[PDB]
Amino acid sequence: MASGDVERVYTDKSRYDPGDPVTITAQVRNTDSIAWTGTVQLRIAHLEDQVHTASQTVTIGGGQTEDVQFTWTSPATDFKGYLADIDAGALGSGTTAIDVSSDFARYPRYGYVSEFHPDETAAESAAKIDELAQDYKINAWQFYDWMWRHETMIKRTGSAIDSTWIDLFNREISWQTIQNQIDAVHDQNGAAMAYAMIYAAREDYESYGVDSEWGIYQDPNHLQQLDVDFGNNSTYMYLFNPANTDWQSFIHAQYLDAINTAGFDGIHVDQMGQRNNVYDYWGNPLNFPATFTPFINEAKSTLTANNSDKDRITYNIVDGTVDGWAANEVSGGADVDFLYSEIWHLSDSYIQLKDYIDSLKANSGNKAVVLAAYMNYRENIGDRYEAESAALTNTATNNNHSGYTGSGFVDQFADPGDAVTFSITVPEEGYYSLVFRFANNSGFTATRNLYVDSAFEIELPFQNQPSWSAWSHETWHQVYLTPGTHTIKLAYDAGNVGAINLDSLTLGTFDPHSIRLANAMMAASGATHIELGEDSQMLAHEYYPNRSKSMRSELKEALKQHYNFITAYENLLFDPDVVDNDSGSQFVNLDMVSASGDASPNTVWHQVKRTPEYNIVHFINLANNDNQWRNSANPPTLHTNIATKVYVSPDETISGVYLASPDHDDNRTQSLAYTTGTDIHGDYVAFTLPSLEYWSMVYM
Ligand SMILES: [Ca+2]
Ligand SMILES: [Ca+2]
Ligand code: NA
C-alpha cells in the first residue's frame, strides 16, 4: 500500500527568456512507513498540445519528503505560457506554470515588499521572495515605503550611505535588507520596482535642495501649498507641480539614484488622486491631470538614457473608472511599461470594472493592466469573540451606548490592574489578525498592553473618536499561532493610559469567495491584481504594511492555482491579439442555469473572446452573489453537468473543445466530447460543462 502526495511543484525562476533552461521541482512526500520506488513522469503542455515528456525512477524513504527535479530547455519562441505536470502515480500529482517572456511588462504579476527591518536576514529576505515567485509566479515586486524621505530617497552622511534610516511612520529601514531583497528578486528573474511619488517632498524641503517656487497651491497668492497633514504638527508631505521642469530635474535624479545605487529595475510612481482648483506659485491655474503625462514621459526618457535595461516605469491612475480623472490622459499618452490603477468606488460592479479595463486597453494599444483593488476593505469579518462574554478582571459589562454587537460591551476599563481575556480557537498554524472593536471619547489616545498565551506581545494604541457611540475596529495586531486554544489578553498595566470600551475581538480573515471571483473577473477581462506580498501577506488597505486581515490556507491554495492558471493560459488571457468577440449575449446558452452576458447578479456570466487561433468562452459563476467585486461573498451555487451551446460562424473551423479551470484538476486542460448542429437561432457547438464553481474557461 504505497501512499503520499505531491505537496508543491515549482520552477526555479518566475519568468524565462526563450531558450533558458527551466528546472522544475516536485516536493514529493511518502506517507507510508517504508520507502517507495517508482516512476515520476513530467508532462509539459502548451494549451491543448503535449510538447515534452520525461521520466525517472526515484526512491523516497518512509515519512520523507524529497525534491524530484527535471530540467527542460524552453522553446525558442517568445511569450508562451506552459503547464508542467508531475505525476508520481500512487504518491499523487501536481502542476506548475512556466512563463517564457523576454519582457515581464507583457505579463506582469505584481506583488509587494513593505518590510525592510534590520533583523531580517538574507535567508528570510530570500524565503519571502522565493515563496511568492514559486507559489504565485510573481515576476515583479513593488518596494513600498523603502525610501527615507519622499524627495531624498537614500539617506547619506556625506558620501557614506547610512546603514539604517527612519521613515515617515518612524519605521527602521535597513539598506542591506533592501539590497538583499532586490538580489533575491533578480535571482527569480524578477523586476524590483521602487515606490516613489510623482510630486511629494517632506517637511523642511528647502534644506534638501527643493524650491518652494516649484510647489502647487490652493490659491493664486502662493499662501497655502497643497499638503498631507499626518496630524502630529510636524510630519507633512508637500505637493509640487509635475509639469515644472526643475521639479522634474530634481526628482528624476532621485529616481536615477535609486536605480543606480540600489539596482532597482524601475520606478513605481504614485499619486494622491483628484485635486481640483490648483495653481502654481505665480497664481496660474493648472489643468492638473494634464501635467502627469509630460512628467512620466520625461521620466521614462531620463531613465532610458541612464540604463535601458533598468528603465521601467508605471504610474498609478487613482480612482479608476471609464473617463476617470487622468485616466484617458495617462493610458492614451504616457509611456508606462504597463498600466496600473487603484480602484475605489467609481467602478463598483464587475461590468463597470470590465468596461474600465477595456478602455485602458483600447487607449493604450493593449498594454497590460494591473489593478490595486483592496479586497474586503474595512469589513470586520472573521471569527468573532464578544468582549462581554470573555474573562473580566476589574472591568464590567454594560449596554448604555449605541453600536455594540452581541448583548453588550466591556466598560470600567480605566485603571491599572484591569484586563479583558479572550479565549480563542484557531483551526490551523498560521498568521491571525487580532482586530479589536472599541470606543474612546477620552479626548486622547488610550493604550493597552497585549498578551498572548500569558506572554507580552506589544503595546496597542486606541485612537480617540468624536463620541462614545462612534466605534472603531482600526486597532489590530497580527500574530503567528499553532492550532487549537490560545488566550488573548488586553491589559491596563501600570504606564498605560486612557479609558476605553471594548466590544469584541475578531480574527480578521480575507474572504476567499469574493477574492476568487474578483481575480477571475479581472483575468477574464485582461487585467491582473496587485494583492500578494511579503510571506504570503495580502493587501487589506492602501498602507501596505497593514495586517488587519490574514489569509487562511484554503485561500492560499486557491491563489496558487489561480496565479498558475493565469500564467499557463496567459496567451489566451493577456496577449495583445486577445479581443472581445463582437456578438452579444445570445452567443451562449446554458440549459436550465440562469446566465447573463453582462455580469448580472446571481447568474453564470459568460464572456466570449478570441485570438487569431482560438475562440474562448469564460464562465464566471455569480450564482448566489451580487455584482459588486470588493465585498465579501457567499460560496457560489455549485453547478454540475451544464448542457452548453456556443453559437459560432458557419465558416469557423473546429478541431476539439478544451476546458480548463483554476478550480479543478490542477489547471490541466480537458478535451470534452461535443457535437455540432444548427437550430432556429443559428450554428452551434454543444457540450457538457462537468462543473462550474468560480471560473471555467473553454477554448477551441
Ligand atoms: Ca459586544
Ligand atoms: Ca459581490
Ligand atoms: Na440559461
From TrEMBL:
Q: Which residues bind Ca(2+) 1?
A: 386, 388, 405, 408, 503
Residues that, per the record, bind Ca(2+) 2: 626, 628
Q: Which domain of life is it from?
A: Bacteria
Q: Name one GO molecular function term.
A: carbohydrate binding
Q: Which UniProt keywords apply?
A: Calcium, Glycosyltransferase, Metal-binding, Signal, Transferase
The enzyme's E.C. designation: 2.4.1.248
Residue ranges of domain CBM6 in the record? 383-508
Task: Give the family this protein belongs to, as stated in its UniProt record.
Answer: Belongs to the glycosyl hydrolase 66 family.
* Protein name per UniProt: Cycloisomaltooligosaccharide glucanotransferase
